[PDB]
Design a protein around this nucleic acid. Structure first.
Ligand code: CA
Ligand code: CA
Ligand code: CA
Ligand code: MG
Ligand code: MG
Ligand code: MG
Length: 759
DNA sequence: AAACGTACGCAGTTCGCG
DNA sequence: CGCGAACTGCGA
């Protein structure tokens, strides 16, 4: 089983290292024969003697071409002749790259920016995470002493907890009387003891939650301040910090650092992603949270530290439990893509597509297109195209609604119509498929590059969905529902990759052909169900639509819907298929992207409403939820109007807990890049002068107080709110939070804001 | 060195023009 | 002084 690959340099030569786990034993295989290379397209073969003489320099090393070789390849399915240029060290490629491209006889260069370790995995046909080997796992978490305005890791680490199959333990240097706590003398002894535990346990996988940005960087700064060699790698090395766009990433040589946070962010949809929220969302059970102020208070006063150790132990225990459930899913993704679990777990969906396309290109002798240059990148950014069809809904409260959905609409269109840049506007084909409105024709004689790969991906989704019904365990059901939704997003991201400005296989024509076909298929399906089956489409987005037959019972709508499904699916060709997704007793459609329906089991589902958004106060969400329940489940409009009146009364009388008035908004840039200033930005600028570091990703939690000026003038952070001296802006939360979230719903019954507010 | 798939959409905050 | 627009955050 291949776990990871990298390369080291021995006497100026690269040495590929393959970290493996075969027969329960860890092994490092070495390879000194793999040669870095990139391709070049020449105006004439006679010029190869000049390109061989082109040199460059990196550090104090002279870079030359080691060997050339003429190769017969394909570029988007067309025969092409390129020259394969070999080199000694992979770092020779970036040093000599542009000089070779700048030669007047070199048309272009190709495949010049592929990392050496990933190139090895592709060229040798190696698939990581392959086999039945059982990987040992060990999770850990840290608890630190934090104070406002201090530098990062200025205070010491207080506790280090770890968990595996043997249980969970906490190492700390203050005496805490608990059977799972090991007490040492100093912070240095604690870090050394944890380092020994890892060396003795020798886990293949180190599991963290946000270890890429906090736990590992905190341990590093603390180790260099205390002069500790943080030797965690199986080669005796220290954890290495890497840069991936905005955030950082930590790797441990010889092992797999599995950070759950990027995985959970791609797998589950939650309002907040604290460890306690993720744990309760997966295992249904609550987890207590202890904040850094209570940790610092308990440590410095010496009172209440058992509660802190319990929170630290549960942090490691829960992180291990979540790592166990989510590793096999990420391991399968590492097999589908063909890259190490470390990269696939934190990779964005764009690179998940491209890394697989790079592997498949090499398998089919297809020369890979280059990443766009600056001029082409800016050009791709400006241009856009039409997307999905969104119908202005029929507003009001409807009954006996069915939702009909297309099964993987965009992937089905790519396969059915062979939408691919190697088939777009090809010449000499016997059969073409022309996209509506945009007129792009596509060859059907042979399976296009991307379409020849989406079928298997869709097949795995149905295999997971089939096991997603035979299972009775809700835990297995949820994890399988999680995994199949992952495959749907990945398969759908193949369409988006066509419009991704950084995509190698960028195809704007392919992208708009997919959406143009999608718009035609749903518009046709809507017209058919209304003309030939007497339905009334109430709302429609990109791949699905709600509909009903007015003045008909639930049974009539169900049988007629199933009948229309037989009709329209016989007309729809290829992989285009409409499914019966659900029936709903009542439904409300506020506007585009804003709806709410209740199924026959009294379960309410909403789309786009304030109930889902995290930038709205809790009192507004709580109020909107109760209103929707009174309308969808009880059908009592006066009870819903009543509820809004009680809330506006309780707010006006200051009887609502200020906790439900907190507004959460994320800072999306540096505080200097803000052209306009709002309540959360104005508060964040106050938090900077108070000592809190503000950066993109920082969530600002503020509350609006009764006062003068703009809302930003009245906004203060919640941690500064004292209910003894501050009276919140009851008028603001009435007029700007509760009332707007419910007025657009209750307007369909004739009610205005004046009829709902308290007087 | 590596670099957030895509379009469509609502709505609060602020503030100057007419 | 109410409208519109620029800005902003987050929502298949
Ligand atoms: Ca739905
Ligand atoms: Ca689907
Ligand atoms: Ca907002
Ligand atoms: Mg690596
Ligand atoms: Mg003390
Ligand atoms: Mg663009």
């Amino acid at each position: 089983m291949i776990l990871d690959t990298d390369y080291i340099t021995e006497d100026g030569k690269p040495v590929i290292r393959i970290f493996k786990k075969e027969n329960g034993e860890f092994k490092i295989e070495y390879d000194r024969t793999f040669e870095p290379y990139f391709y070049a397209l020449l105006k004439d073969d006679s010029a190869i003697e000049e390109v061989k003489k082109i040199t460059a320099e990196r550090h104090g090393t002279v870079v030359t071409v080691k060997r050339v070789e003429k190769v017969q390849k394909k570029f988007l399915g067309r025969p092409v002749e390129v020259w394969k240029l070999y080199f000694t060290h992979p770092q020779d490629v970036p040093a000599i790259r542009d000089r070779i491209r700048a030669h007047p006889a070199v048309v272009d260069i190709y495949e010049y920016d592929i990392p050496f370790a990933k190139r090895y995995l592709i060229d040798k046909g190696l698939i990581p995470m392959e086999g039945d080997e059982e990987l040992t796992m060990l999770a850990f978490a840290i608890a630190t002493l934090y104070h406002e305005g201090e530098e990062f890791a200025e205070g010491p680490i207080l506790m280090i907890s770890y968990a595996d199959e043997e249980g969970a333990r906490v190492i700390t240097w203050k005496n805490v009387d608990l059977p799972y706590v090991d007490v040492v003398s100093t912070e240095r002894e604690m870090i050394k003891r944890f380092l020994r535990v890892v060396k003795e346990k020798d886990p293949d996988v180190l599991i963290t939650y946000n270890g890429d940005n906090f736990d590992f960087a905190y341990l590093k700064k603390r180790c260099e301040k205390l002069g500790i060699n943080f030797a965690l790698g199986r080669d005796g090395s220290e954890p290495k910090i890497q840069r991936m766009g905005d955030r950082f990433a930590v790797e441990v040589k010889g092992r797999i650092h599995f950070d759950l946070y990027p995985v959970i962010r791609r797998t589950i949809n939650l309002p907040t992603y604290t460890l306690e929220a993720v744990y309760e969302a997966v295992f249904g059970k609550p987890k207590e949270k202890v904040y850094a102020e209570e940790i610092a208070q308990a440590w410095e006063t010496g009172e209440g530290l058992e509660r802190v150790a319990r929170y630290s132990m549960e942090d490691a225990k829960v992180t291990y439990e979540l790592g166990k459930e989510f590793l096999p899913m990420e391991a399968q993704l590492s097999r589908l893509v063909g890259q190490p679990l470390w990269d696939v777990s934190r990779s964005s969906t764009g690179n998940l597509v491209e890394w697989y396309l790079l592997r498949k290109a090499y398998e089919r002798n297809e020369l890979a297109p280059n990443k766009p240059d600056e001029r082409e990148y800016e050009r791709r950014l400006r241009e856009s195209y039409a997307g999905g069809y969104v119908k202005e809904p029929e507003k009001g409260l409807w009954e006996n609604i069915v939702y009909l959905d297309f099964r993987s609409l965009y992937p089905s269109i790519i396969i059915t119509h062979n939408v691919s840049p190697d088939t777009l506007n090809r010449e000499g084909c016997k059969e073409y498929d022309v996209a509506p409105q945009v007129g792009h024709r596509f060859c059907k004689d042979f399976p296009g590059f991307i379409p020849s790969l989406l079928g298997d991906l869709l097949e795995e989704r149905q295999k997971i969905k089939r096991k997603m019904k035979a299972t009775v365990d809700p835990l297995e059901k949820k994890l399988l529902d999680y995994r199949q939704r992952r495959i749907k997003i990945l398969a759908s991201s193949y369409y988006g990759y066509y419009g991704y400005a950084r995509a190698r296989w960028y195809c704007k024509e392919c992208a708009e052909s997919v959406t143009a076909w999608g718009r035609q298929y749903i518009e046709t399906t809507i017209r058919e169900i209304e003309e030939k089956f007497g339905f009334k489409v109430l709302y429609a987005d990109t791949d699905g639509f709600f509909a009903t037959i007015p003045g008909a019972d639930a049974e009539t709508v169900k049988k007629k819907a199933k009948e229309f499904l037989d009709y329209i699916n016989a007309k729809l060709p290829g992989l285009l298929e409409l499914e019966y997704e659900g029936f709903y007793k009542r439904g409300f459609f506020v506007t585009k992207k804003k709806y709410a329906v209740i199924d026959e089991e009294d379960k309410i589902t909403t789309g786009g409403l304030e109930i889902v958004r995290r930038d709205w106060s809790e009192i507004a969400k709580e109020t909107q939820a109760r209103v929707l329940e009174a309308l969808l489940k009880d059908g009592d409009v006066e009870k819903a109007v009543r509820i809004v009146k009680e809330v506006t009364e309780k707010l006006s009388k200051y009887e609502v807990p200020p906790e439900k008035l907190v507004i959460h908004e994320q800072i999306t840039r540096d505080l200097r890049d803000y052209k306009a200033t709002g309540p959360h930005v104005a508060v964040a600028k106050r938090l900077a002068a108070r000592g809190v570091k503000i950066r993109p990703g920082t969530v600002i939690s503020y509350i609006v107080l009764k006062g003068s000026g703009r809302i930003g003038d009245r906004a203060i952070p919640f941690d500064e709110f004292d209910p003894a001296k501050h009276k919140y802006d009851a008028e603001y939360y009435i007029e700007n939070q509760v009332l707007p979230a419910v007025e657009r719903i209750l307007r369909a019954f004739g009610y205005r804001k004046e009829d709902l507010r308290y007087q």
